Amino acid sequence: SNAIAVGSERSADGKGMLLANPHFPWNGAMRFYQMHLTIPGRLDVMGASLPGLPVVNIGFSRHLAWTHTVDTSSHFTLYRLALDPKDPRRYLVDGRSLPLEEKSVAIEVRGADGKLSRVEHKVYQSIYGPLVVWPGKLDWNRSEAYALRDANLENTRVLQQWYSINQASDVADLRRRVEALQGIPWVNTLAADEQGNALYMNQSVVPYLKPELIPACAIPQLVAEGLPALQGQDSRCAWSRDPAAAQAGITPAAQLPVLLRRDFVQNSNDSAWLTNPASPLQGFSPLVSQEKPIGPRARYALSRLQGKQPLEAKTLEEMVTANHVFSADQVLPDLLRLCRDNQGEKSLARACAALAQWDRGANLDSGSGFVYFQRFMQRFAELDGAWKEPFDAQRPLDTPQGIALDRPQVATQVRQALADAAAEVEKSGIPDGARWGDLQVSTRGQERIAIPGGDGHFGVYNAIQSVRKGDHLEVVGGTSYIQLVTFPEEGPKARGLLAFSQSSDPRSPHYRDQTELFSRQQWQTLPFSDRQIDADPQLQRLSIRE
Amino acid sequence: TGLAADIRWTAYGVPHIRAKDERGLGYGIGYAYARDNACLLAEEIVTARGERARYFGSEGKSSAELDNLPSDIFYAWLNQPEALQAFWQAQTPAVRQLLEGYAAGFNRFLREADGKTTSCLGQPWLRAIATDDLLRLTRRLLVEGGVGQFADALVAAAPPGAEK
Ligand SMILES: CCCCCCCCCC(=O)CC(=O)O
């Protein structure tokens, strides 16, 4: 997901502006749906929501627009259990042997004969939560097991929280409402208001441990690998209680990252750290936010956002619709140098030609160079010390950069990687004349619609994830609900689309209508005022009661 | 009863729901959503109820790409009656009303559906929903940043035997 909030110091009109570009599945339980909700006099909000929720999840109102992105904070902890040496179904806390709880569930299964059979399954639970097994990493043997405590199991506040957000007036009010309730499960919140405030909040439900406890309570080897793992044999490693937290054992709102500015804030699923590089967010718990290298989507955004020039709505729109493969900026110049250095090699000819002719985009008309670049990058990712300039904490926006072609070892391995990538592309069906939009599609009935965009890991802001299905790459997730909001005098101006269309049902008039528009990158008005709604020549109305 | 909504749809089938209270508002939402996505909600509710294997057998998967039986075990564990009731008891009157209205509006559409925009008409899993079903969906989403990512791992957790 991407989000950019622009404030009065940087917007072309001196007001607030928000780009909402969540990246989510194109099917299933997290498929966004647009709606506008009004209880005249006290609620008036429009945006998109997840299936089954009677609230707007990402949206806007008279003076406010807000969106979300998945955060890097931990929303659970694993607990390594020290098992009772006499009994692997018992575990030690402060040297005392406790029994695991056994909770049985029964499931009905429809068989080959069409009849139902009952299957009973035992779920083992500790004081922390259920046990979990990852064969070969988190086993349950005679020495140890792992339990999982999910902080959001106790978050009964989630629906109240979005309904409260739906009622928020401005950025200050939004912040109060989110900090008060702490019902946001696992996302950041970014927002802008008419007055020109830009807000970032890493305000979610996060397990709390006091600073002093972390060194002895963490499992060093597992934390090093990014897993929130704690010592489950010591009662002192229970989540800490703070009276200020809305829920026992979660981090109080005062200790979670918030940035309130008048220039910009952004996030593309990295930590709070470089939300705005002019004001780095630092000194938080490792469970909350760490100073880790930013992904290419954020690096791209920051390359467009930093500086003095006013940001227009069009600027933010085009950051999505350009389909720029930003990872190519770090790698492709040197790759092309290697290409020119090896013109005699027939195993590289097709790859090097395609890469040279490539517009560095994931547009419908982008050449096969994108496909070659993808397969190369997948192998490049696996190489050791191949960056000319490795990541520099002092230069977190401009590193890593370039290929260490200096090194004979790197040059060899990079050439081999390109050779291997070229072989894979050519082993596939795709002729070199084929363009990206000939490959990446979304199926609608028996037909296909070409879809622009590419994987977020390649730095395409318009992130689209696809899988091979039949002869094409079938879109599974990515750019979904798009909302670009500004605040001119008359009322909020919202522009966007729902990429996969309103209805998942092939019979619906609204099964592929916006998908055709997404293919052509033609965003539309999201009508909010009664004037806008009434101006729509497709307007239909139904009143219902029972 | 006490359920009433006014719905306007603009281009692309975007609903604009107007009502005097949360019950009415939910009524309009559930109805409009069902018009577009009744089958999708029905399927995800079967998932969140832990009933995939019951309707579809053990060879299929959920839309989260989990095997039906492990998925069912996970959701039966997650959405036990005591968990749903505690969750409900903790809801504000406004949220309860939104959910009550949503269920009623979805069900209203189902009563009237003739297949115009509903491809799964006549399937046994397309059926009236309850507020508990909406709680099941909510809880499923709630844990997507936590224990939901360990659904297979939870199902796989069994104590060791006598092995060397
Ligand atoms: C009951 C749990 C509700 C959680 C809703 C999740 C918020 C919706 C916005 C996003 O998800 C943004 C994203 O896709 O990254």
Side-chain angles (χ1 to χ4, degrees), chain A residues 33 36 38 42 110 125 133 142 150 156 163 502-505 507 530 536 540-546, chain B residues 3 5-9 11 15-17 19 22 27 36-37 53 77 91 108 111 115 119 141 147 153 161:
Chain A
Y33 177 85
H36 170 198
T38 309
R42 71 187 180 77
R110 184 196 173 93
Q125 302 175 157
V133 165
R142 298 200 162 252
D150 180 320
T156 56
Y163 194 48
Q502 278 286 79
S503 173
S504 61
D505 202 297
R507 295 178 175 196
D530 284 330
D536 195 326
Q540 280 159 18
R541 189 179 176 191
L542 181 66
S543 301
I544 47 163
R545 79 192 285 109
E546 71 186 57
Chain B
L3 296 150
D6 180 76
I7 310 166
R8 290 177 297 177
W9 290 269
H16 307 256
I17 302 102
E22 280 79 5
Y27 193 56
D36 294 315
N37 285 299
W77 171 84
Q91 299 311 296
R108 164 79 183 259
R111 286 196 302 279
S119 295
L141 290 171
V147 72

Side-chain angles (χ1 to χ4, degrees), chain A residues 284-352:
Chain A
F284 296 91
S285 164
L287 291 161
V288 169
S289 184
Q290 297 191 55
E291 312 182 7
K292 287 297 158 66
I294 52 168
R297 282 181 291 117
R299 186 170 168 190
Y300 170 76
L302 290 171
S303 75
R304 303 295 169 187
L305 291 171
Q306 288 185 101
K308 312 289 206 184
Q309 292 319 292
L311 298 161
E312 294 177 16
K314 190 188 188 182
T315 317
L316 303 190
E317 173 173 336
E318 292 181 347
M319 287 173 70
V320 178
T321 62
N323 294 297
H324 183 58
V325 180
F326 184 71
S327 291
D329 287 21
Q330 293 90 60
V331 171
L332 184 64
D334 287 344
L335 195 55
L336 293 174
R337 291 178 182 100
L338 182 140
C339 275
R340 295 191 297 274
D341 282 344
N342 293 278
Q343 289 163 116
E345 270 181 17
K346 297 159 187 186
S347 75
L348 300 176
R350 283 184 55 173
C352 288

Side-chain angles (χ1 to χ4, degrees), chain A residues 1 22-24 32 50 57-58 68-70 158 162 186, chain B residues 138 141:
Chain A
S1 290
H23 301 154
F24 244 21
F32 276 114
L50 299 185
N57 290 128
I58 291 173
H68 301 290
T69 60
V70 172
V158 59
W162 264 287
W186 36 257
Chain B
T138 297
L141 290 171

Side-chain angles (χ1 to χ4, degrees), chain B residues 1-163:
Chain B
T1 202
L3 296 150
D6 180 76
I7 310 166
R8 290 177 297 177
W9 290 269
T10 49
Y12 320 124
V14 179
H16 307 256
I17 302 102
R18 195 173 278 251
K20 73 183 208 307
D21 55 25
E22 280 79 5
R23 289 181 60 74
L25 189 75
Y27 193 56
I29 300 168
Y31 183 92
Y33 190 73
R35 189 178 85 154
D36 294 315
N37 285 299
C39 306
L40 179 159
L41 204 75
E43 275 267 2
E44 300 308 336
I45 284 164
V46 165
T47 298
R49 290 172 62 86
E51 290 168 349
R52 297 209 61 76
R54 182 196 182 87
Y55 287 104
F56 309 120
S58 61
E59 285 190 21
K61 292 188 169 75
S62 68
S63 63
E65 303 299 329
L66 302 188
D67 284 2
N68 282 352
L69 186 39
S71 181
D72 287 352
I73 289 155
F74 177 75
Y75 289 108
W77 171 84
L78 178 68
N79 290 326
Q80 288 170 59
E82 302 96 319
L84 297 186
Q85 191 45 42
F87 193 91
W88 180 252
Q89 208 55 37
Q91 299 311 296
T92 64
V95 167
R96 291 182 199 203
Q97 289 162 23
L98 289 169
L99 293 166
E100 287 166 0
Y102 190 110
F106 189 93
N107 292 346
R108 164 79 183 259
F109 179 83
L110 286 196
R111 286 196 302 279
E112 286 160 10
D114 76 3
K116 185 140 63 207
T117 58
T118 309
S119 295
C120 63
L121 197 78
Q123 287 302 314
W125 47 266
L126 180 66
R127 50 207 290 151
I129 70 178
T131 54
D132 274 352
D133 295 321
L134 300 180
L135 300 187
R136 290 177 176 99
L137 292 173
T138 297
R139 288 177 57 83
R140 165 170 175 201
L141 290 171
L142 208 35
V143 306
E144 164 80 3
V147 72
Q149 297 297 329
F150 289 74
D152 290 314
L154 179 154
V155 173
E163 59 269 14

